[PDB]
Each structure stands twice: as C-alpha cells, then as structure tokens.
Amino acid sequence: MERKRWECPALPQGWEREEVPRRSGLSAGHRDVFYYSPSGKKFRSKPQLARYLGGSMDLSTFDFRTGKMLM
DNA sequence: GCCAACGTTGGC
DNA sequence: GCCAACGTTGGC
Numbered sequence: 001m002e003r004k005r006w007e008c009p010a011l012p013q014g015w016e017r018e019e020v021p022r023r024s025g026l027s028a029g030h031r032d033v034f035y036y037s038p039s040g041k042k043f044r045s046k047p048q049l050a051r052y053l054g055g056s057m058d059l060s061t062f063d064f065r066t067g068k069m070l071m
Numbered sequence: 072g073c074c075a076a077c078g079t080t081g082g083c
Numbered sequence: 084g085c086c087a088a089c090g091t092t093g094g095c
Contacts, residue, residue: 025077032076042074045088064087 001029005036008067012057014038017067033065 005018016036022028035043043049046064053059061070 020075022077027077030077047088 008035010062010068011035011053015053033067035067 001021001023003018003020005016008015008017011017015038018034018036019031020034022030022032032044035049037043037052041052043052046059046062049062049064050059062068063070
C-alpha cells in the first residue's frame with residue numbers, strides 16, 4: 001500500500017505508469033493504474049490512452065492494468 | 072470549477 | 084462475481 005510511479009518501457013519515451021492503492025471505503029486496497037504523457041497529461045483508461053497513442057503505436061495487445069504487451 | 076478518491080454499472 | 088471504464092462529488 002505505497003504509491004509507485006516511473007517510466008513504462010511498453011510505451012514511447014517519457015511515458016510513465018503509476019499505481020495508487022485506495023486507502024479507504026469498500027474498495028480499499030484496490031490499486032488504480034494511471035499513465036502520464038511526456039507533457040504530464042494523466043490517463044485512467046485504455047480507450048482514453050488509445051486516442052493519444054493508438055495512431056503512433058499498436059495498442060491492441062497492451063494490457064492497461066499491467067503496463068505490458070501481452071505476448 | 073477542478074480533480075483525487077471512491078462508487079456504480081454494463082459486459083463478460 | 085469480476086473488472087474495465089468511467090460517473091460522481093467532497094474537499095479544496
């Protein structure tokens with residue numbers, strides 16, 4: 001239950017991935033996953049991410065929750 | 072007025 | 084029953 005954020009190598013240069021554990025309520029302990037662009041914009045779902053990156057790379061096998069390409 | 076934080080819901 | 088995707092809002 002600590003927040004983690006650094007470079008995601010499945011994405012282009014300067015994109016970062018973050019995990020935030022929820023501290024309270026019914027879903028306490030669940031880890032939300034976010035991505036940050038080089039410009040600092042925050043993404044919270046894959047369709048949202050694919051609107052930015054989907055032109056400039058293939059995202060069909062990118063697993064948003066794990067941050068890796070499924071092979 | 073935003074947005075981090077948690078809940079709701081549809082699709083499987 | 085699970086969870087991807089996002090709706091909603093208290094606290095700022």
